Each structure stands twice: as C-alpha cells, then as structure tokens.
Amino acid sequence: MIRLAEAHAKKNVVELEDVQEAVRLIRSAIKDYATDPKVQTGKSVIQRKLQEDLSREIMNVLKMSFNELIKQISSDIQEALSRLQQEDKVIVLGEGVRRSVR
Amino acid sequence: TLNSHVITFMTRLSFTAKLFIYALLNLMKKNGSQEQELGDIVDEIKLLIEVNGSNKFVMEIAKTLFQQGSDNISEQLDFVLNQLLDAGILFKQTMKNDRICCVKLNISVEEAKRAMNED
Amino acid sequence: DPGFGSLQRRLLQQLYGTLPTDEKIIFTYLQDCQQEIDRIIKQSIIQKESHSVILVGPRQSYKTYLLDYELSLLQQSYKEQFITIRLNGFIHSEQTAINGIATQLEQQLQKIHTISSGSLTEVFEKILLLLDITKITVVFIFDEIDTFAGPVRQTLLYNLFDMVEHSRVPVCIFGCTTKLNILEYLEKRVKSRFSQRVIYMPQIQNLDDMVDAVRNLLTVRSEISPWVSQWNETLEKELSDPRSNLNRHIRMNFETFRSLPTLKNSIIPLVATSKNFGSLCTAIKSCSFLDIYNKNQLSNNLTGRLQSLSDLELAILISAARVALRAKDGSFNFNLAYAEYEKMIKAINSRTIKLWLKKDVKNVWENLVQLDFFTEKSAVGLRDNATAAFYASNYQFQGTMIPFDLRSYQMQIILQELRRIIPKSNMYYSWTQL
Amino acid sequence: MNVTTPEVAFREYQTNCLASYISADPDITPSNLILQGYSGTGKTYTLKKYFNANPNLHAVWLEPVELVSWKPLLQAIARTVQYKLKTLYPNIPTTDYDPLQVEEPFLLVKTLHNIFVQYESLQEKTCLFLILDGFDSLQDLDAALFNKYIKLNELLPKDSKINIKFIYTMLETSFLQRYSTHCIPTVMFPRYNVDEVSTILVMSRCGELMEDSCLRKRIIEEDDQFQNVAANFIHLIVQAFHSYTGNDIFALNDLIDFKWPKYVSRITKENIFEPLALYKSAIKLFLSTDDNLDLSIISKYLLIASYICSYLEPRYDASIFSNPRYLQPSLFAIERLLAIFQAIFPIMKANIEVFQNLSELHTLKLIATTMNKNIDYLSPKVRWKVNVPWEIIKEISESVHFNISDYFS
Ligand SMILES: Nc1ncnc2c1ncn2[C@@H]1O[C@H](COP(=O)(O)OP(=O)(O)OP(=O)(O)O)[C@@H](O)[C@H]1O
Ligand SMILES: Nc1ncnc2c1ncn2[C@@H]1O[C@H](COP(=O)(O)OP(=O)(O)OP(=O)(O)O)[C@@H](O)[C@H]1O
Ligand SMILES: [Mg+2]
Ligand SMILES: [Mg+2]
C-alpha cells in the first residue's frame, strides 16, 4: 500500500485522496470471503434504515445545504434524497440547499 | 381459500425475524445441502453486519442487536427462533446443542425469496 | 399518598387486562379483527346459526384475549342462551377429550336452569345423542388444535365438525392454533365438513400502530385519581416527541421483538417500583429502569456466564476450544483438554501461576457441564413429548459406563466468539487466536 | 400495590422485581412467574425472606425433585392445596377429596374445580401461590410438560374467589429459551462475583463458627476477638479455593467445615493476635484441596492383554508377539484376548482358572461389552472391550514388572 499510494501522486507529498485509492485496489481482491472462500435493499436493509436516518437530521432543523448533511451525518446519500422526492417528502429547491415538506 | 398467507406473513415480521430467513437462504446458495446448522446461521449473521462497519449508517443497528443501546450490556452472541417453529415455516431437530443443530425449511423455497425482496 | 395509590393500581390493571367488559382496551390494528369474530358470535347465539372457524396466528398474538372479550360482552345481555365449553390441545389428550366435553356439559346445564357417568364408551354415546322458545348454542373453544390433527386418525375432529352441518343444534367451534398451514393437517373427510373459514390474525406493520397501542394501555379515561390529568399530559408529551426515551424503546422493540405482551413485561415493574408521583414521571422520561431490565434478561446466557468465571474456569474452556477447533469433528474429552491446559501454563511462566494437579480439575470440569458449556456428542437431551422421555430413561447410554476422562464432549461456543467477549486486559487473550 | 420489600444483600433488583408481580390482588398479579437462575444465585433465600416479612400472602411450597416421575407431581398439587386451604379457613365446611385420583392432566382441572366451588363464601379474592422450587430439576422431563402448566388458568373459572398462581424456579438457560414466545415475566438471577461470594459466607457462617465446641475448648486448654478470627478463616478459604470451586456456595461451604477443626487446633497463645504466624503454621490447609476424605496375578495380566486388543489393530499382531489411547477403545473377541494373554504371560493353557478371572473382571466393571442388562457370555455376536483408563492400567503393569509403554511407542 505504500508503493501504491506513492505511485498515484507521482505531487511531492502524499495526500489523503491518494491513500484511499490504494485501499480500494487491495480490497478489490481480498474481500467477499472470511472463514470460507468460494438484494441489498430488503435483505441487507441499508435503504430501509437510511430513510429514517437522513430524514431525522432534516426534521431536527425545522424543530440545509448538501455539504452540511454529509458533515452532520456519497453515492447512497443522493439516492436516498431521490426516493423521498417521489413520495412528496422533501423539496429540491435547487442544488444549493434543500427544503423539507410543509 | 386459494390464497397463501405464508407470503404475507414473513413480510410483516420484524428485522430480527427477517434477518434469520435471509441468512438461511444465503447459506443454501453456497453449499446446496438443505441442512444448515444453527452455528452457521449465527456466523453468517455477524458476517453481514461487519461488511460496512466503518460506515456510520450500518453501525447504528449494531448497538441494538448486540447491546440494546446500553454500555453495561456486553456484546451478545431466542424469540425469533421459536416463533417460526410454531408457525409451520421453520423446522428444528431434537438436539441438546445450539451449534450443530440442523435447521430445515418446511415451506417452499420459491415463495420464501419473494418476501425478502419486498422489504 | 392516597392519590398515587389509586393511579398506580389503575395503570397496572390496564397492562394486565383485568379491566371489566365495559372498559376494555381495543387497539387500532386489532379493531378490524374483533369485528369479524363478533359477527360469528352474534350469529350463533342470537340468530342461532351453526358456524366453524379456526383462528390461525403466532404466539401471543391476542387470540385468547379476543375470544374472552366476546364471551364477556354476550354474557352481559344473553347469559341464558349459550354455554362455555373450553378445550385444550396440550392438557386434554385423545382419550381425555371425550370425558372433558361431558364434564363441562353437566356443570353448565345446571347453571342455566348423568352425562359423564359410566365407562368411556357410554360417555361418548350420550354425547352423540344430545348434540346430534329456542335452542342453546354450544360454543366450543378449542385451543392448540394442531395437536389433535394427527395424520393417523382424527376421531374428535370428525365428530366435532359433524355437529355443524348435519346436526340441527347450533354449535360454534372456535379453534385456536399456531400453524399457518392448518388446512393440510386435516384429513380428506375432516376438511370436507369444514367451512374453510380461516381468519388470520393481523400483525404490526408500520411504526404508528405500536405507538397507539402503548398510549391506549397507559391512559386513564376515568376520574379516579387527582393525578390522572397530570399523568396524561406527561405520557402524551413523551410519545409525541420522537427524540424522547419512550419512543426509542418502542422503535427498538419494533425491529427486534414486535410483540405487545413482550414489551409489557418491562412497563409493569417500572410503575410498581415508583414510590410517589415524582418518581413515576422521572422513570417515564429518562427510562433508567428499562435499561436495567434489558441487562438482566441477557445476564444468564452464554455471554453473562463467562464474566462469572475465575481464572481456572476460563483457562479450561479456552484450552478445550482449541482442541475441537483443530480437530475434524470437534470431539474432545478430559484427557485432550488437560494436555492443552498443561502446555499453556509452562509456556507463560517460561517468559507464578499455580499449576493444579489432575485431581483438582475434575471439580472444575463438572462445574462447566452444569453451566451449559460442554454438551455430549450425539446426545438428544430433552425429549419432545412424554413418550420418548420414558424410553430414553430405561436405556443405559454408552456415556455413563465409560469414565469421565474418556467422554466425548462438544463446545457450545467456538474460539472465534470467545475472542470478541474477552477484553484485552486479560492474560488469556493471547491463547485465543490459534 | 401494598407490600413490604425486604432488604437482601446484593439482591436489590431481584427483591424489587418480586414485589412488582407478587401481590395480594389477583387483578395486578400475573398467572405465571419464572425465576430463572443457576445454583448458588440465591433463589430460595430471596423468596423465603420475601414471604416471611409479609404474613398476608398465602404461598404453597412444592419440591418436584422429590417426586421423580410426573405422575406424583399432579397428586402433590391437589394434596397441598386442599391442606393449605383447610387450615386457612377452619370455619368453612369443605369436602375432602382423594389426591390419588389425579392420574391425567385433565383430572387436575376437575379436582381443582371441585374445591374452589365450596370456597365462594369469602368477601375479597384471595390468591393461592403455588411455588414450584425446581421445575426443570424433575427426572422425566419433556418439552411438552411446561405447556400443560402455563395454560391451567385458562380452564379455571374466571368467577372464582381463589385463583391459583404458578411460580417456577428454573436452573439452566436453554430450558427457558424453549418457551420465550409465551411472553412470561422472567426474573433472572446472575451469579455472584469474588466480592459478593465472600461477603455472603461471612454473614452466614460467623454465627456458627465462633460458638462451635472446638473453638471454645481451645481457648481454655492453651466476643469481638473471636469474630475477626472466624472472618479471617473464611476470607483465606475463598482466596485459596476461588479457582477450584469457582463461584458456587455449596462447593465453598464444604471446604470450610472440612478445614475448621484442623485450623482451630493450630491456634495457640501467640497465634491469637498475630495473623501472620497463624497462616504459616497451617500452610497445608490452603495449598491443596486435601482430596475429599490386592489383585490376582492372572487378573492383573488379563487387563494388560485387554488394553492392547482394545487400542491396537489385529492385522499387525503377527509381527510383535510372533495416540489411539485418547479415544474410545475398540471391541475384540474372546479368542483374540487369550492369544495375547498367553504370549505376555511368563513361563500355560487356557483352563478354568483363566475364565474364572475373566468373569470376575467384568463384575467389577473393569471391562465393558455390548450389553448392560441380561448379558449372554456364550453368544458369538457379543464382543468385549476394555473399560479402564490409562492411569489405572499403568500402575497395574508396574506391579508385575511388565513394560506396557513400549507397545504403544
Ligand atoms: N382473560 C384475560 N384477561 C387479561 N389478559 C388476558 C386474558 N387472556 C389473555 N390475556 C392477555 O393476552 C396476551 C396475549 O396472549 P393471548 O392469550 O391473547 O394469546 P394466545 O396466542 O391465545 O396465547 P399463547 O400463544 O400463549 O397460546 C397476554 O399477554 C395476556 O396478558
Ligand atoms: N444475598 C445473599 N445473602 C446472604 N445469604 C445468601 C444470599 N444468597 C444466598 N444466600 C445463602 O445461600 C445459601 C444456599 O443458597 P440456596 O441453596 O438457598 O440458593 P438457590 O439459588 O435458591 O439454590 P438452588 O439452585 O439449589 O435452588 C442459603 O442458605 C442462603 O442463606
Ligand atoms: Mg391462547
Ligand atoms: Mg433452591
């Protein structure tokens, strides 16, 4: 991982973005296995738990920008916002800030 | 009368009962023996939790399923097990051990996967 | 305080369900289920119509509670038009079910205004001559009907269903079972006489269904205490706010248990332990007693039993786990566990732990077996019914003749799970990786 | 809820849980109450003190461990209920029923219904607690036995002045998890640690150790001073046997009585005020547990040949006479045993003396077979195997000067 992160920036220093890219290359081959070698919406929740997690911070504000939601709580973040928009739960109001339902 | 209430029964269960069915079906697609022990289901449930442990969205459920939101409660390793046995869905042999006890499915396998995808 | 004593007793009577019929608590999700049951009861006692419906639902799904409320509602107006005949599947067997019907008939007929006399053959003969201005509805309450639906013969199930179609006496059979596929458990002729009326009990779907049920179980709708108006404001404040402690325990039980009688086991001791009104509002807001009840329920399992062990009890279980892990079938005895424990003491002291002799580990080995840790290899254990329990006691197993140092045992917890429930401060953590 | 909560040592949560369920009003009292807890947790101590301070509650004690089978259990319930209700209200003329007529689970409902009908002359509802101390300790135990007792209150009439109350005290954990779907308020009992075990034994054994006959006879031959002496011996016993006993109360109480007379006689006129010299004088009472408190020549050689035939294959026997000991021994034949026994015997045909020692070897349970009761020695299908450990067979071969360790090396 040291030579992989150093060759990505070859930049005179090693930034945090170069180290994160080296871990993805190592995890691409050593994963999906543990004690034995050899879908995620209902069985592995994630989508069911994120609907109550991201909306919890929005409801607490009314009692926000797209960059503030990440710092307070990013492919799954934008996917959860599009699900609530179809059910009339949130308001887009542009890409800058977000507005909750009245 | 011609309807089947087994499909709609698993869709209204809790997360602990739905996780036990999803863990049993995943073990059948790896070995293909129709006889998974009780020790393999426990190891498969913990394996799915530690998939994305570094993310804050998945660790919110680990504190409840293993500590119930309490620091004094230690990390745990029975309610959802005996519930499916009396409903005629899950089977369990007469064994005094809780690791090598085989678990078999009484209902069909095609109708069991439709309830997991509906959640 | 006389004001707090009247409110504490009223709040406890609502959770147990001992309220009278004129003040019963009906949930929102169960309102559409009791209406169908009330229609069958009102049609067999008033209209005198024979019916047959077998209820199907999970354990503690408000099955007997809904049937007891329907019998109490009809007894407050039509108490001389029907009788109560209750039956069980676990208590009453095949031969005892015949005498149970005749026994409950002689005691109910003398109360409105013999049958159970003789041998077993003469008792069943008088029942068929009775069941098979108005009549009297014979309400049959059958509990655990899956035990009587044996694939060998269903004699009682065939005679009970015959008292509905062919017989003119109105007989209302309300079976209560837990099997979802109760139609396949019947015979070809038993299912023919049934009306195929299977009413499935509803379950908790969304989260708002559990909040309305808890609110209806802790709200005093009667003027019996001066603290009633103050208690309703505190309960409504904590329930309407999702950031409170009461809404957190409900959401946690909704995704883990999703059962109303299960969650009611912690609200009852929370109110009874309060000394005054100030202690009741404090425990209902912070929920400090709820965290203590959850720790006690998981204190005698496989995790809580490891913390109550000494240094020798932990070294034996660790050394015995490494033998079954490195083996093929996981078989080990006292001789294999003592070899790993002896090699661990000499390895740690070489880098003073008192090494116990072989005559002292026998007491520690027998103490771990009673604590549910070492199970016998290929052992059944507790039998299902009483038939297999008698045949197993008369047969001498092979594990009782062999000595204790040659008995094949099995580990109830693998070495992978022991490394997670052991902190890094213990000295036995280095021998749990292998 | 009007009841008195006693003060139990290290049982503050367990005593408060019993007062929230057990009450004098059946409207706020559950029909089932399980008291799960292993041995040495204080289940009986927290229940006797709770019922002794409150004399308004009527509880019936029953020990299912003294009835073996489940048939006498149904007879002891109706016998103890009628006997308790007789002395409770002697001004009521009731009819005595035969408790031996309860042989079926259905007969228990009819017997209990014939008793509650003659007790309707009371004013308020009086509870009837039926404590079952040790339900899982019954011999003929099955998974369908507990299902017949949790539904007994359903068959009972609701308009009765006396309602029964079942109280179970389980011991193991897997037996409780088999009925977790019934939603029963279970009160668990965790095991004590190293700080609560020694404190319990001090407040329970100091009242009998300082007033013993041995300690009173030692001070006259050689009350605050005798209290610290008895308290020091209890603390020294627990700290020296914490690993041998664990956290059991019965395992530590037996070791105290076994070492009390040996510790009193070692006390002189100088060891009464100096506890350092007293521990060194009796060093043989804490370093070990002190445990607990003629074979024939042909019989000795027969056990040696039986150990070889049960731990070695018979296919390589034509190369020696011409770890397998860690597993179960194998079965051999009678003629296969006499062949090796004749080879290892020093300078003999198979007469009746050899078969006489072999028949006596099976009486002492030194060699196992294939049948336990009614064995046939003349049957050709019944095989024989060894039944002695390696440590026992090692000392036997050493007395006859026979090398038994070289055959397995
Ligand atoms: N007569 C009654 N009075 C008060 N509460 C009652 C009564 N009957 C039942 N209940 C309550 O009903 C709740 C749910 O159990 P219920 O008996 O309704 O379900 P069940 O499915 O018939 O039972 P089980 O699963 O044990 O066979 C219990 O927690 C109990 O408190
Ligand atoms: N907290 C305590 N304080 C003082 N003494 C205690 C305490 N707990 C238990 N004891 C003592 O422990 C002794 C032995 O325990 P006991 O047999 O009563 O416990 P148990 O858990 O009910 O047993 P079992 O599992 O055999 O039914 C009792 O005589 C009692 O005096
Ligand atoms: Mg019921
Ligand atoms: Mg006891």
Curated annotation (Swiss-Prot), chain B:
Coiled-coil region(s): none
Location in or out of the cell: Nucleus
Taxonomic superkingdom: Eukaryota
Signal peptide: none
Further remark: Present with 3930 molecules/cell in log phase SD medium.
Family: Belongs to the ORC1 family.
Functional note: Component of the origin recognition complex (ORC) that binds origins of replication. It has a role in both chromosomal replication and mating type transcriptional silencing. Binds to the ARS consensus sequence (ACS) of origins of replication.
Record note on domains: The N-terminus is dedicated to mating-type repression.
Oligomer status and interactors: Component of the origin recognition complex (ORC) composed of at least ORC1, ORC2, ORC3, ORC4, ORC5 and ORC6. Interacts with MCM10 and TAH11.
Protein name: Origin recognition complex subunit 1
Species this protein is from: Saccharomyces cerevisiae (strain ATCC 204508 / S288c)
Parent-protein residues present: 785 to 908 of 914
From Swiss-Prot, chain C:
Gene3D superfamilies for this protein: P-loop containing nucleotide triphosphate hydrolases
Gene Ontology cellular component terms for the protein in this record: DNA replication preinitiation complex; nuclear origin of replication recognition complex; nuclear pre-replicative complex; nucleoplasm; nucleus
Subcellular compartments: Nucleus
Superkingdom per UniProt: Eukaryota
Alphabetized Pfam families for the sequence: ORC4_C
GO function terms (MF aspect): DNA replication origin binding
Keyword tags: DNA replication, DNA-binding, Nucleus, Phosphoprotein
Gene Ontology BP term (one): pre-replicative complex assembly involved in nuclear cell cycle DNA replication
Homology family: Belongs to the ORC4 family.
Further information: Present with 2170 molecules/cell in log phase SD medium.
Quaternary structure and partners: Component of the origin recognition complex (ORC) composed of at least ORC1, ORC2, ORC3, ORC4, ORC5 and ORC6.
Known function: Component of the origin recognition complex (ORC) that binds origins of replication. It has a role in both chromosomal replication and mating type transcriptional silencing. Binds to the ARS consensus sequence (ACS) of origins of replication.
PANTHER family in the record: ORIGIN RECOGNITION COMPLEX SUBUNIT 4 (PTHR12087:SF0)
Name listed for the protein in its UniProt record: Origin recognition complex subunit 4
Organism of provenance: Saccharomyces cerevisiae (strain ATCC 204508 / S288c)
Gene name of this polypeptide: ORC4
From Swiss-Prot, chain D:
Compartment list: Nucleus
Keyword field: ATP-binding, DNA replication, Nucleotide-binding, Nucleus
GO cellular component, one term: nucleus
Domain of life: Eukaryota
GO BP terms: DNA replication initiation; pre-replicative complex assembly involved in nuclear cell cycle DNA replication; regulation of DNA replication; silent mating-type cassette heterochromatin formation
Protein's UniProt keywords contain Ribonucleoprotein: no
Other comments on record: Present with 768 molecules/cell in log phase SD medium.
Function: Component of the origin recognition complex (ORC) that binds origins of replication. It has a role in both chromosomal replication and mating type transcriptional silencing. Binds to the ARS consensus sequence (ACS) of origins of replication. This subunit is a candidate for the mediation of ATP-dependent binding of ORC to origins. May also be a substrate targeting component of a cullin-RING-based E3 ubiquitin-protein ligase complex RTT101(MMS1-ORC5).
Protein name as it appears in the record: Origin recognition complex subunit 5
Species of the source: Saccharomyces cerevisiae (strain ATCC 204508 / S288c) (Baker's yeast)
